[PDB]
């Protein structure tokens, strides 16, 4: 019984491997061996934001390129204005162990969650001058590690019980569940058309999910340890993954396999966050040896360094018009570079 | 500057004035993490110090006008190499062990080895509670189960000269107690570096002094931390 199923798995695995190998007729490095490089890239610190009492663990820009939300493990979400550094909102939470935050694409809500297995929604523009909790979404059986809005009435969450879910806010019930990972799910990324998404687990694996029918379309392997961050290429046909073995990689969807590996011979730390430039030429990445690195995404050569944090870098994000970069670390400070 | 800019600046000033108070309250409260296994009696210690669905529970007690918070994690899976990283800035970890269970003692030892040696938990002290002393006395005096069936080296062990067998107990109980204590103190001293220590205590299920012991140990931890600046 088990022998037949194991044999079936082995045969299908071998066939899929051979089918992928039959279509590998060139490598990205060779075809991109004739491009003039980008030279040295040097960036400067224009703002520094002070005010948290403990480490910072997440951050997210708005669709206006001007306002930020950030969150600390002392019980505070803070909404910042970056052109001047004025503070706009400071929201005290109920549980002080919080691991993620997100900002709505219209400017009217924020969300957060953590070791208590609940996602809480906060409504900003109310009839009074305050912010009031509107909803508490409960039903996961492990901590929340990421969440992203689709509109003002749907949200997607990933948790440490090895699942993902899609929630209807006005009702408070799960509209669909995405099961199939084996370890803890650690990150999400939404497609530009918001009809698919991708996720990566505490298992050297990533998966492509279709929202409408709740099925898994493809599986991608290649890393050697757990995956910590993920994001899409600007046109929506490739993505990049950073893992806990000192390596980023770039995968492509249509060809169904790996394209490039970004690694160095003197780097032996882990990776905490990744993101892309607006045209897709640069890839930024944050490490836990206190630093961030800027790579050339088409030739795989290091081009720059961001340095100036006294503790492990944890979050990192790039605006919707490409003007600025924001970093946050475990020493309680946010920095804006340009 | 127009009226809008001045109004924004005053709003930011109010937020700052509140954050100062929150800072003063936060800086004067101690935070503790409670760890153990299901057969350890961890809950009895919790309920005893409670006289001073969800994924985490909290217990608040106060001694001599100092406030302690104690955090206990429930309703999570049994893989813990990711959420444990959230606890790298507490004051102390409290580790509870059932000392009468010979079968599941090497697992407790392995847990201690992992907690002692992590990269993000290298500067945090441990308070160790070797629970259930009376059950250990009954088991040893019964004479039908032998410790050496799991640890051979007990056959070559003698009682230390700093023992304090105050209430006139049987000598065999004293040998057993101090052997089991030394098993954890070996791991404690093998790979420390002067950055964190371990404080062992014998205890049972009818004690009334665990809060005072935590008070004194936390006091000493803070004093060493202050002194370390003069090196």
């Amino acid at each position: 019984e088990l022998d037949q199923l194991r044999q079936e798995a082995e045969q299908l695995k071998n066939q899929i491997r051979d089918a992928r190998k039959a279509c590998a007729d060139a490598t990205l490095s060779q075809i991109t061996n004739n491009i003039d490089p980008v030279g040295r890239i040097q960036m400067r610190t224009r703002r520094t934001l002070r005010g948290h009492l403990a480490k910072i663990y997440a951050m997210h820009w708005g669709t206006d390129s001007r306002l930020l939300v950030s969150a600390s493990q002392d019980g505070k979400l803070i909404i910042w204005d970056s052109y001047t550094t004025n503070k706009v909102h400071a929201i005290p939470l109920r549980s002080s162990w919080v691991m993620t935050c997100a900002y709505a694409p219209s400017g009217n809500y924020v969300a957060c969650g953590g070791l208590d297995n609940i996602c809480s929604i906060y409504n900003l523009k109310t009839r009074e001058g305050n912010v009031r909790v509107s909803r508490e979404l409960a039903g996961h059986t492990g901590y929340l590690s990421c969440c992203r809005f689709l509109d003002d009435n749907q949200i997607v969450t990933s948790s440490g019980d090895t699942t993902c879910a899609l929630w209807d806010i006005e009702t408070g019930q799960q509209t669909t569940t995405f099961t199939g990972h084996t370890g803890d799910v650690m990150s999400l990324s939404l497609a530009p058309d918001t009809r698919l998404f991708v996720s990566g687990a505490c298992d050297a694996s990533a998966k492509l999910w279709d929202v409408r029918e709740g099925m898994c379309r493809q599986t991608f392997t290649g890393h050697e340890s757990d995956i910590n961050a993920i994001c899409f290429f600007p046109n929506g046909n490739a993505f990049a993954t950073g893992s806990d073995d000192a390596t980023c990689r770039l995968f492509d969807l249509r060809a169904d396999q790996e394209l490039m590996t970004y690694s160095h011979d003197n780097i032996i730390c882990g990776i905490t966050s990744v993101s892309f430039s607006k045209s897709g030429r640069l890839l930024l990445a944050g490490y836990d040896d206190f630093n961030c690195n800027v790579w050339d995404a088409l030739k795989a050569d290091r081009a720059g360094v961001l340095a100036g944090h006294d503790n492990r870098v944890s979050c990192l994000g790039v605006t919707d018009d490409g003007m600025a970069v924001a970093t946050g670390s475990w020493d309680s400070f946010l920095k804006i570079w340009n | 500057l127009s009226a809008e800019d001045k109004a924004a600046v005053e709003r930011s000033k109010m937020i700052e004035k509140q954050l100062q108070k929150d800072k003063q309250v936060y800086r004067a409260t101690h935070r503790l993490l409670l760890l153990g296994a299901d057969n350890s009696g961890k809950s009895t210690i919790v309920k005893q110090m409670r006289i001073y669905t969800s994924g985490i529970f909290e217990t608040k007690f106060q001694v001599d006008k100092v406030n302690f918070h104690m955090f206990d994690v429930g309703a999570q899976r049994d893989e813990r190499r990711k959420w444990i990283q959230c606890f790298n800035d507490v004051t102390a970890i409290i580790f509870v062990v059932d000392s009468s269970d010979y079968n599941r003692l090497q697992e407790a030892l392995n847990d201690f080895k992992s907690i002692w040696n992590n990269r993000w938990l290298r500067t945090i002290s441990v308070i160790l509670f070797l629970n259930k002393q009376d059950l250990l006395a009954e088991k040893v005096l019964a004479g039908k189960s032998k410790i050496e069936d799991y640890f051979p080296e007990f056959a070559r062990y003698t009682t230390p000269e700093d023992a304090t067998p105050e209430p006139g107990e049987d000598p065999r109980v004293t040998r057993a107690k101090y052997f089991i204590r030394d098993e954890f103190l070996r791991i404690s001293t093998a790979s420390g570096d002067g950055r964190h220590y371990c404080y062992p205590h014998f205890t049972c299920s009818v004690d009334t002094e665990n809060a005072r012991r935590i008070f004194n140990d936390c006091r000493d931890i803070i004093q060493r931390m202050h002194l370390r600046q003069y090196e």
Epitope: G183, A204, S225, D245 | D78, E79, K113, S114, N118
Partner: nanobody, 127 residues
């Protein structure tokens, strides 16, 4: 694609011996610390022995101390366990496990129920 495959189990009489071996694939072998665990009919998972990256540090559990030996080969990418004088309490299903991250002294989560970097195991019977 991480892969670990154990081989060498079987059925022996008391006082006999055998030798288990894991063949590994999909990662740099000599970056990681390796372990042997086991499960017996009616209990949970129990840690048996441990070896480091170079072969210079070795550790055992109490009940097997003078009898089992652990060793590794970084050229063929393989682990060996030698079991010498066996008792009817040694019958079990044996598994081969890898530490989660490289270049590390600790080892979280090797005995848990569902672990990603563990093999399929082999059956050993003493009778």
């Amino acid at each position: 694609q991480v892969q670990l495959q154990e081989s060498g189990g079987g059925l022996v009489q008391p006082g006999g011996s055998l030798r288990l071996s894991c063949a590994a694939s999909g990662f740099t072998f000599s970056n990681y610390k390796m372990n042997w665990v086991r499960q017996a009919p009616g209990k949970g998972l129990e840690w048996v022995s441990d070896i480091s990256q170079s072969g210079a540090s070795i550790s055992y559990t109490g009940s097997v101390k003078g009898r089992f030996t652990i060793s590794r080969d970084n050229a063929k990418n393989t682990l060996y366990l030698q079991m010498n004088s066996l008792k009817p309490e040694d019958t079990a299903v044996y598994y081969c496990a890898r530490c989660p991250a490289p270049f590390t002294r600790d080892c979280f989560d090797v005995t848990s129920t569902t672990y990603a970097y563990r093999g399929q195991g082999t059956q050993v019977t003493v009778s």
